[PDB]
Ligand binder design. Structure first.
Ligand SMILES: [Mn+2]
Ligand SMILES: [Mn+2]
Ligand SMILES: [Mn+2]
Ligand SMILES: [Mn+2]
Ligand SMILES: [Mn+2]
Ligand SMILES: [Mn+2]
Lengths: 308, 308, 308
């Protein structure tokens, strides 16, 4: 089962420009050539060419609706194709709003996929509860069935079909959830391991509980949507919304090594890398290298070593 | 149960910079406005005016005996006051010698309370074992009932009445304990979780054992005396006695979240925040914001999120 | 139980700056003084003078054989002599190639000894598998009985006899293993706890298993070979091959404290400190102060405290 690298240099889902540079920054590190070194065959789809929507005025408080909807509708189609072709999709992107297309496309082919969301945030605010109107903080809202109809139709998102149930997603790294989002994950019974449960249980038991919860009954495709801000600012500083007390570099790798071991990874997202937000060049180097390491970890690179 | 914020700009406990701006530093950070946003009511008692004792000559080695023990009285009378009004006292001050006043007065109203002391130090040096003479490193010595009758009375500490036994306190975070102190903690059988114990058990087990030890029998008012230098210098830089290998930001929040969950927190101290000891501008801010985060956590703010 | 410091200012085992200055830097940080403050009697044998061999050209891919072989021959005799007298040897060296002579010498007096290797690397590449030819990355290859005969004899190493069995050594901290090396530890069934195992189990369990595996059936002397790069670069930056995601300052101390508690420590190596690789003079101080603290910990210095 080969790998399909897909670049999504998009930032309209958030206010901080620079995130569209993430794909180039990651490729610059030799991500594709380093991935080919693994036991997986790699193919680089290249980046997508998202084109802005003319009079794309805010829909209520939501900004760039049509453009974010259009960019995502294209990614869904792209990821759906690659998924149908028996390959694992890996999206390097701008902001996390792209998880809409990525996950949607992935779910069209594998409607039984489960999601592991590594983030400092729940990104589950909806067009009504969001206190910012930035779409990278609402992706899970357009994807969850339980939220379907719980908010007005958004211009440009008519194509989206709620593909995942509240029971098919697990959050890890949470530590900056707004009032609305917390109410939601709580009333919907969504499984999450906030930084509190990680400190209490240790990353080892956390993954055990994540897999028993998602892959307990039967096995199914795993979609890992990784927001680099899920890790501590010490390791992934070049990002739009950094939050202290995050996942360590080590816990980040552990998560990926365990996901690798299941042999069920079907879709992967590496998001929010913003190379223009490094206080120094080295904070970017640090962020990019951590992102590359986790990506390779998802595909076999183990810290104890590897050989053929 | 409402909250009572008490200021304590006192630095006669230690020479290093000026830890009096601490109270004023935490306020500017918006500590009061954020606490009111919690499920508690909040009232600011204002910063106490400490009268400096005249020819307050050192006692053998201890410096500013009268001055220190006087500032603690006003505070101790101010604390006992709030404790009687059925309010939770939150002392925002300078050096940790002020724990003498906070705890004594708290114990005057609630003599059955227990103590959780987060610190890199034991601060249990007697006026005779101490190697510096600074009182910020002797509070537990003027508070323990087993230590009374082990050192000459000190000018200005006659009022103090040993309010805690050797089985009513639990230390968490130890990593720099002088020979004298280590003998006492061991001879008296004081319960403690040095960093060694934290590394071994993990902060999750550390709190389970703490509560089991202090509350296993009867439930009682908990007094949390938090010395910011209990957290690793990488997190709480602006402090007088930094020691590498301390508690992490996450472990610090775990402690406070678990304590809030007991519903027993009755007294609190957030000491040693010296904003004048911050190499760079962001080391003071980082220290102050961590101090504020630790306080909010104590009163309900959780990393998994909150909502009304 | 007396202690004898043995200086090994060598660097021909690798390229980089000046690891020969390692011993001078540690004594500078007052390692001898601090050692004499513990419960052990200390003595400093000073630094050994190594005779640089003439036409010492490369053997196949292996660099400076005759130089590294002879040097280790000198150290083996010296460490063998000190061990003879009933003293614990502490070797402060340059690069890790010096463990060949340190462990070889040690095994002559304690042939039943075991080894705990703290490193980010396995240092078990043979002259045929090595991709660099630097001998500081092949020490364990010379020491293991299971590997004798698996590679060609090296000029200047005929004085070496495999002393340790593939079942008498445990690795802790691994995170940068070469294909050849990984194949070897897997095929030879060597016990190791890579960063993955430490993240999984916690450092507390790692030492419990390390000891059960090593001291379970028979109690015997312990030789600790500590490569400072086993700890994360944020703590020990001044070293030749730093690798991110390492053991923390706290974990390294736990390791040493636990080893100390067994009462079986008999040999110790504090390697790879290069006070010229420090990006800044402080990065050197930080690396130096950390190695000194680990040494002191091996001899009873505990974070909970120490008294006479
Ligand atoms: Mn996100
Ligand atoms: Mn995020
Ligand atoms: Mn203190
Ligand atoms: Mn302290
Ligand atoms: Mn080594
Ligand atoms: Mn190494």
């Amino acid at each position: 089962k080969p790998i399909e690298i897909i670049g999504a240099p998009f930032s309209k889902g958030q206010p901080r420009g620079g995130v569209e540079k993430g794909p180039a920054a990651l490729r610059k590190a030799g991500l594709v050539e380093k991935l080919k070194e693994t036991e997986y065959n790699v193919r680089d789809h290249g980046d997508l060419a998202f084109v802005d929507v003319p009079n794309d005025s805010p829909f209520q408080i939501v900004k760039n609706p049509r453009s974010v909807g259009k960019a995502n509708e294209q990614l869904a189609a792209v990821v759906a194709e690659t998924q149908k072709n028996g390959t694992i999709s890996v999206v390097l992107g701008g902001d996390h709003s792209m998880a809409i297309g990525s996950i949607s496309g992935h779910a069209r082919v594998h409607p039984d996929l489960c999601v592991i969301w590594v983030d400092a945030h729940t990104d589950i605010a909806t067009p009504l509860t969001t206190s910012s109107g930035n779409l990278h903080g609402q992706p899970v809202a357009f994807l969850l069935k339980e939220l379907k109809g719980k908010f007005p139709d958004v211009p440009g998102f008519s194509w989206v079909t709620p593909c995942i149930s509240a029971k098919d997603i697990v959050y890890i790294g949470l530590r900056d959830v707004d009032p609305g989002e917390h109410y939601i994950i709580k009333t919907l019974g969504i499984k999450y391991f906030s930084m509190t449960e990680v400190d209490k249980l240790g990353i080892g038991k956390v993954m055990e509980e994540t897999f028993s919860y998602l892959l307990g009954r039967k096995k199914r495709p795993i979609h890992l949507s990784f927001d680099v801000d899920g890790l501590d600012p010490v390791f992934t500083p070049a990002t739009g919304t950094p939050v202290v007390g995050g996942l360590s570099y080590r816990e980040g790798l552990y998560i990926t090594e365990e996901i690798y071991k299941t042999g069920l990874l079907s879709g992967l997202d590496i998001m929010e890398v913003n190379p223009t937000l490094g206080k120094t060049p080295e904070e970017v180097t640090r962020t990019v290298n951590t992102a590359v390491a986790l990506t390779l970890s998802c595909f076999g690179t183990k810290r104890e070593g590897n050989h053929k």
